Design an enzyme around this catalytic site. Sequence first.
Site, PDB file in Angstrom:
ATOM      1  N   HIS A 210      -5.910   2.279  -6.532  1.00 16.71           N
ATOM      2  CA  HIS A 210      -5.686   2.918  -5.239  1.00 16.71           C
ATOM      3  C   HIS A 210      -7.013   2.961  -4.473  1.00 16.71           C
ATOM      4  O   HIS A 210      -7.865   3.819  -4.735  1.00 16.71           O
ATOM      5  CB  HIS A 210      -5.113   4.326  -5.420  1.00 16.71           C
TER       6      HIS A 210
ATOM      7  N   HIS B 296      -6.110   4.851   2.065  1.00 18.51           N
ATOM      8  CA  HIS B 296      -5.719   6.156   2.602  1.00 18.51           C
ATOM      9  C   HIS B 296      -6.767   7.262   2.489  1.00 18.51           C
ATOM     10  O   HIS B 296      -6.434   8.440   2.325  1.00 18.51           O
ATOM     11  CB  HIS B 296      -4.417   6.597   1.933  1.00 18.51           C
TER      12      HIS B 296
ATOM     13  N   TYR C 199      -8.975   8.039   0.272  1.00 20.84           N
ATOM     14  CA  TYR C 199      -9.306   8.643  -1.011  1.00 20.84           C
ATOM     15  C   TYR C 199     -10.663   8.106  -1.489  1.00 20.84           C
ATOM     16  O   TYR C 199     -11.402   7.535  -0.676  1.00 20.84           O
ATOM     17  CB  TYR C 199      -8.154   8.415  -1.999  1.00 20.84           C
TER      18      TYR C 199
HETATM   19  C1  LIG Z   1       5.878  11.342  -0.462  1.00 27.96           C
HETATM   20  C2  LIG Z   1       4.962  10.153  -0.379  1.00 27.96           C
HETATM   21  C3  LIG Z   1       4.087   9.938  -1.436  1.00 27.96           C
HETATM   22  C4  LIG Z   1       3.222   8.860  -1.412  1.00 27.96           C
HETATM   23  N1  LIG Z   1       2.368   8.662  -2.474  1.00 27.96           N
HETATM   24  C5  LIG Z   1       1.515   7.586  -2.491  1.00 27.96           C
HETATM   25  C6  LIG Z   1       0.664   7.370  -3.574  1.00 27.96           C
HETATM   26  O1  LIG Z   1       0.662   8.110  -4.565  1.00 27.96           O
HETATM   27  N2  LIG Z   1      -0.186   6.290  -3.541  1.00 27.96           N
HETATM   28  C7  LIG Z   1      -0.191   5.428  -2.459  1.00 27.96           C
HETATM   29  O2  LIG Z   1      -0.955   4.462  -2.442  1.00 27.96           O
HETATM   30  N3  LIG Z   1       0.649   5.643  -1.385  1.00 27.96           N
HETATM   31  C8  LIG Z   1       1.502   6.714  -1.402  1.00 27.96           C
HETATM   32  N4  LIG Z   1       2.336   6.923  -0.323  1.00 27.96           N
HETATM   33  C9  LIG Z   1       2.342   5.927   0.797  1.00 27.96           C
HETATM   34  C10 LIG Z   1       3.511   4.965   0.504  1.00 27.96           C
HETATM   35  O3  LIG Z   1       3.247   4.176  -0.645  1.00 27.96           O
HETATM   36  C11 LIG Z   1       3.846   3.998   1.634  1.00 27.96           C
HETATM   37  O4  LIG Z   1       2.750   3.148   1.858  1.00 27.96           O
HETATM   38  C12 LIG Z   1       4.176   4.735   2.926  1.00 27.96           C
HETATM   39  O5  LIG Z   1       5.174   5.709   2.692  1.00 27.96           O
HETATM   40  C13 LIG Z   1       4.631   3.773   4.022  1.00 27.96           C
HETATM   41  O6  LIG Z   1       5.683   2.950   3.575  1.00 27.96           O
HETATM   42  P1  LIG Z   1       7.193   3.309   4.024  1.00 27.96           P
HETATM   43  O7  LIG Z   1       7.281   3.136   5.524  1.00 27.96           O
HETATM   44  O8  LIG Z   1       8.075   2.329   3.315  1.00 27.96           O
HETATM   45  O9  LIG Z   1       7.489   4.732   3.617  1.00 27.96           O
HETATM   46  C14 LIG Z   1       3.221   7.979  -0.334  1.00 27.96           C
HETATM   47  C15 LIG Z   1       4.084   8.207   0.735  1.00 27.96           C
HETATM   48  C16 LIG Z   1       4.956   9.286   0.708  1.00 27.96           C
HETATM   49  C17 LIG Z   1       5.881   9.500   1.873  1.00 27.96           C
HETATM   50  O1  LIG Z   2       2.151  10.063   3.517  1.00 21.46           O
HETATM   51  C1  LIG Z   2       1.302   9.718   2.449  1.00 21.46           C
HETATM   52  C2  LIG Z   2       0.542   8.565   2.525  1.00 21.46           C
HETATM   53  C3  LIG Z   2      -0.299   8.211   1.484  1.00 21.46           C
HETATM   54  C4  LIG Z   2      -0.372   9.022   0.360  1.00 21.46           C
HETATM   55  C5  LIG Z   2      -1.203   8.708  -0.714  1.00 21.46           C
HETATM   56  O2  LIG Z   2      -1.988   7.541  -0.666  1.00 21.46           O
HETATM   57  C6  LIG Z   2      -1.267   9.528  -1.826  1.00 21.46           C
HETATM   58  C7  LIG Z   2      -0.504  10.671  -1.885  1.00 21.46           C
HETATM   59  C8  LIG Z   2       0.327  11.006  -0.838  1.00 21.46           C
HETATM   60  C9  LIG Z   2       0.398  10.191   0.285  1.00 21.46           C
HETATM   61  C10 LIG Z   2       1.237  10.537   1.335  1.00 21.46           C
END
Ligand SMILES: Cc1cc2nc3c(=O)[nH]c(=O)nc-3n(C[C@H](O)[C@H](O)[C@H](O)COP(=O)(O)O)c2cc1C
Ligand SMILES: Oc1ccc2c(O)cccc2c1
Length: 378
Positions: free
Chosen positions: A177, A180, A182
Site C-alpha cells: 500500500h 492515499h 499513508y
Molecule cells: C470502506 C473503504 C475501505 C477502503 N480500504 C482501503 C484499503 O484498506 N486500502 C486501499 O488501498 N484502499 C482502500 N479503499 C479504497 C478502495 O480500494 C477503492 O480504491 C476506492 O473505494 C475507489 O474505488 P471504487 O470507486 O470502486 O469504490 C477503501 C475504500 C472504502 C470505501
Molecule cells: O475512502 C477510503 C479511501 C482509501 C482508504 C485507504 O487507503 C485505507 C483505508 C480506508 C480508505 C478509505
Amino acid sequence: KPTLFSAYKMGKFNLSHRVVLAPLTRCRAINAIPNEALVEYYRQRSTAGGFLITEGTMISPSSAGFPHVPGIFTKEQVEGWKKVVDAAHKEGAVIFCQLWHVGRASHQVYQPGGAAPISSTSKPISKKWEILLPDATYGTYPEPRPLAANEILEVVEDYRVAAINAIEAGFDGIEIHGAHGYLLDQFMKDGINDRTDEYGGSLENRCKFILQVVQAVSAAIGTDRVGIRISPADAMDSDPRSLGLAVIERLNKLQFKLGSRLAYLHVTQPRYTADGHGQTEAGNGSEEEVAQLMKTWRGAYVGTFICCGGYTRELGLQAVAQGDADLVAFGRYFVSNPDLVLRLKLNAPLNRYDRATFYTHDPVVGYTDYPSLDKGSL
Ligand SMILES: Cc1cc2nc3c(=O)[nH]c(=O)nc-3n(C[C@H](O)[C@H](O)[C@H](O)COP(=O)(O)O)c2cc1C
Ligand SMILES: Oc1ccc2c(O)cccc2c1
C-alpha cells in the site's frame, strides 16, 4: 481481443476474468485477528480464477490508524489468515494480502504506549480532516515524529517480515500500500515530504523508501508475488504526472535488473461526479486530464496494470477493451455485492451500499449479510 470477462495470465497466476476485489478496510478483525467473519466475507466474494486483494493489513504495532484492522506480524494473526486464505482457495480465488502502514494518519490511541505516529515529516494532517477513534467518535490527527534513516530501514524490515508471514498464511502474494497519503506516500508526495536528507528532495530520494520496500519484499518472496498500489493524482504532489512516471521508471528498471516482472502495478484515480462513480457529462475537464494520466502511466509501465476508482460496469468493459488496463478493481460495489462478478456478467442491478456500516465492527450486520442473486434450487 481482451474483455473484462476474459482470462488473463498475471505472471505466475491464471485468472478467469478481469474483475478484482479492491482492498477495503472494514474493521471486523477484532483485536487485529482475522476471524470467522473475514472467512465468510472473502469466501462470499470469491470466484474461480478471480483475483482478491485484502483490506489493508498491519505490518507492525505502529502501523494502525483504524480500529479492529487485521495484522500479519504475529503467529496468531497468521493462523487467523490461514483460515481465510484456505476458504478463498477452495473457491478457486487468487488472493493477495495488502501490507499497510498509515504513517502520520493515526492517533495516540492506536499507538503502542500512546507514542506519536511516525512519518517523513513532523507536520500533521490539517484539522480539515478527522480520524475515526475506537469509541465511535472522531478525533484530531496529532503531530507525527519524523523517522531517522535507520528507523526507515526498520520499517522496510517490517514489510519484509510481513511478506514472509503472508506466504506462510498461504497468500498468493502481497500488495504494497503506497497510496492515499499513508506512510510511503508521505515520502513520495512533495506536499508532505519536507525532508532535507537522502530521503527528501529529488524524485529519486522521495521514491527511495517505497523502492527499498519493493526490493526487500521481492527478495523475500519473489517479484512475481509482489504488487504495488499508488495514487499520484492532504496528500498532494506539485507534479503528479512526473511522480507516477518516476515510480514507474524505477519499477521498470528494477524488473530489468532482477530479470522478472512484478505481479502488477495498481493505480487509483479520482472522479468528479456527485457520487464518485462514473464519468461526468461529455464536455468537466479535470476528468479528461486524469483519464490521460492513467493511460500515460499504464503505457509507461512494463507489466500488468490494475485500475481502480469510480469504475462502472461500462467503464470497466471499456478500460479492458481499449487496452487502458489489464484488470479493473471495484471497491464500494464489492461491499454490497458479494457476487459482483456474476452481477457484472449478467448486467444485473447492484445492491446499494451502506456507508454507515463501512467501519462498524459487527461480524454480520453490514458485512456478510448483503444478498447474492437468488440461485434457486437446481
Ligand atoms: C470502506 C473503504 C475501505 C477502503 N480500504 C482501503 C484499503 O484498506 N486500502 C486501499 O488501498 N484502499 C482502500 N479503499 C479504497 C478502495 O480500494 C477503492 O480504491 C476506492 O473505494 C475507489 O474505488 P471504487 O470507486 O470502486 O469504490 C477503501 C475504500 C472504502 C470505501
Ligand atoms: O475512502 C477510503 C479511501 C482509501 C482508504 C485507504 O487507503 C485505507 C483505508 C480506508 C480508505 C478509505
